[PDB]
Design a protein around this nucleic acid. Sequence first.
DNA 1: CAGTAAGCAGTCCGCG
DNA 2: GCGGACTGCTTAC
Length: 901
Amino acid sequence: MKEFYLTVEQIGDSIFERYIDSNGRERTREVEYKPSLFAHCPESQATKYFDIYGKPCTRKLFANMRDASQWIKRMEDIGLEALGMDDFKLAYLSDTYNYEIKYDHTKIRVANFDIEVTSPDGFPEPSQAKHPIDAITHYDSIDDRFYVFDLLNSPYGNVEEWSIEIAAKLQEQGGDEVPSEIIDKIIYMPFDNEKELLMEYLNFWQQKTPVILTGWNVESFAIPYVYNRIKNIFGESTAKRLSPHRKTRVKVIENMYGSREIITLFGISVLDYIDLYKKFSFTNQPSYSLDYISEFELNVGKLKYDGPISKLRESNHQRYISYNIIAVYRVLQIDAKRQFINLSLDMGYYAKIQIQSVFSPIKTWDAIIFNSLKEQNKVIPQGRSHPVQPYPGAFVKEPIPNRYKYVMSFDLTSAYPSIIRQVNISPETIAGTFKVAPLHDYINAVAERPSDVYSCSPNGMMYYKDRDGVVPTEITKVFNQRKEHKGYMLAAQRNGEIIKEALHNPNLSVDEPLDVDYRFDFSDEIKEKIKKLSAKSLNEMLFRAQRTEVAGMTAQINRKALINGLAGALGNVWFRYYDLRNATAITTFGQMALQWIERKVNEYLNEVCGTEGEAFVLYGDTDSIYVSADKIIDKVGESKFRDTNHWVDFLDKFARERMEPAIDRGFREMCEYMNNKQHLMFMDREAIAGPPLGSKGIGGFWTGKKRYALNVWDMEGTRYAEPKLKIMGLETQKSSTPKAVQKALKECIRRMLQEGEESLQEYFKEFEKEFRQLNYISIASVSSANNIAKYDVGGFPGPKCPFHIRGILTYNRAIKGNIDAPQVVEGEKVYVLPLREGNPFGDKCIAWPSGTEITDLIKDDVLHWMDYTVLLEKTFIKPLEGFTSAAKLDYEKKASLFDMF
DNA sequence: CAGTAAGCAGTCCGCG
DNA sequence: GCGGACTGCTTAC
Ligand SMILES: Nc1ncnc2c1ncn2[C@H]1C[C@H](O)[C@@H](COP(=O)(O)OP(=O)(O)OP(=O)(O)O)O1
Ligand SMILES: [Ca+2]
Ligand SMILES: [Ca+2]
Ligand SMILES: [Ca+2]
Ligand SMILES: [Ca+2]
Ligand SMILES: [Ca+2]
């Protein structure tokens, strides 16, 4: 097999590399890597190295990495550019793996661990590590085993051994329901004392040294806790054994407010699953507890126990251990679904970076572009300092707030990356500037043609047409990967809808789910067999289809994020190729394209309908248009349609056979006008939206920019078994809106769009009458809580104190002098409730940590004083009034003359 | 981390 | 009470 790196570090003048050799064995080597850097030189001097602009360079080979770093400094002191890859491990990987990396995940040791620490005096701070580690569960991907290290004797209580037999039993038998599929994979090790536990853990770690290290909050909790506890008991040298090269750094994490402490283990790649989830999941969650995320992702019940966690070990050690094991398994289950570890490996190996660098698109792109340029003996420019400067972004059309009955949407495939490729936007392809006219002159095709030689953006930039830039070249490769995975995602989705249909008529049989590849559209033979399956087999197939769809989503959406991050990186002062000329070339071309095509679509539709001046495009955002199809439907007449699916077909055909050719023609003209390198503006139909045939549903509505709802029948070629709501921006979509409120508002919207005014009034009336019964958590608002200290003035709200911070301060007073009460953590999320006048908390709201029950001390008082009226008005009624006035509907029946009888 | 646009909640305060 | 300036937070792209 081909070799691949596992980890790489620079330590002084050595590269330390862990790798898989040609026999699939793990090895470690220390290499005294001699880096090269580059300086411009005279033309008269023969060389094969040129910078990205074609100026000749001489290579400088250094005796060692420190000489190279010192040289960079002296070049700054002289005032001359020091060219080449200044991150020497990236140069090392590029030299050592000068081919596309084919990796084998089965040879990569992925460790997933979690620790428990009993603490009587509040949260056990990792930087102090003053309490014994009383349990570790460490799952090893190569052994496929959960290694359980269990402390039997502690100053906080001596306990009996954990029982695997009780662990396996149902909770209704008194057991812990540790899933049966892992029972045989548990290797249980009890210990008489913490020192032997930790010594054995370190010996185990030595034998099975993680390459990828993950778990839930491991970076901010488990790793620094284990490190510091070992440090405190044994000394530094012993704690450094967590690093295969015995090197660690205490690293400070700083954004804007405050700072925390993480331990960098040299030669390990830490991918904390919480950070993987935040970067790659594209959710915003009200809470990031593992119980909360597990429930959301896996539909598994909360891990339940009596009393506080600080008393759980002594009261029920059996359950204490079982829950530590389950917690480790839950992260593996989330990963089997979401496949974020697989994604990280793919992207890391593609770029040739440290795997943990996948969190940084700047570092990812820096390395991809470096490897690409190196191939052609080209030399990358030195990174420079730039002051942060604002620059313009997308255009968003102001919609007329209204109901909109029939709507078809279109938007550009991979808009920004496509602009980059079409225009040929790249550091080395800048050809010059032209004299710019106001944007509107380009939109209306009245401005002078920018160039007869170069490819242009309406921001005034011109680009070469003779050859692709490195940015277009590399962005295209990742775009193509994205496209392949999106294809699989969409096929899985369509296949899902086939199964849902079939589920209307399940067969009364005992049979099995078909063995099929859900990434490909089901053949006719598969469809026929599906129509004969039991409900059990169909449901199993649906679950499997949806799992495939999720896997495709992870792979495609994060590749989309990476390429979109390249368009962004051009406006990031930290990027090697930062250039506001290029960042603005992209955004300004986008504004033009949207408004250009708005004009073209309006002109086309006024033509087919025989009108003038009428606005068919009602909305657009960045690269999308929403076209009113009322007139199209009305031209055949609603009476002509057999059912909903019939008009959906008709509009689908109209979009494909009339709209898209017209759109393509308009964009080809724009490409010619801008003299671009390649026409790549592909604006495909997204949504077909409307009310159910013969209903009083309104179909859709807009309240304003980035705020709308549509009843959709077909999304990007997926024809739904049941209509789906596309809601953007409205409160149903915000993590800040109470759970129960999101649900009620969504049902109100469903009724509006599918059923009409009267249905809406029925549901509102019922919701208003019943809502006081809803669980307090389900009706609590949610907010991130930053700068708690800034607004805290002796425990009371300072000037301009935000509502949610006020709540926290209320909470802090209510729990003051309580060591065991959960503390609100700076920068984390809180639930927030309003309080009625004259409550014992002495303020108008309270907040507590999100994803948790409020502490029992005050729970009963919060419940007694919760202001249901304020809650209702602010979270439900106010947004609903916004929706209904926009749609010209009433959520309460108005008096009519019929009332006289 | 460190792409921009733009919505709504809330504070503070004006607005005769 | 609304709205304007402002802070805070959260989406849509
Ligand atoms: N998360 C993001 N980061 C940076 N730029 C973004 C992000 N989301 C959207 N954009 C910018 C770049 C996109 O090309 C453009 C249009 O957004 P959008 O339609 O969501 O994606 P897209 O056009 O790149 O992919 P798709 O093919 O799925 O439509 O807006
Ligand atoms: Ca725990
Ligand atoms: Ca798009
Ligand atoms: Ca599309
Ligand atoms: Ca059937
Ligand atoms: Ca779009």
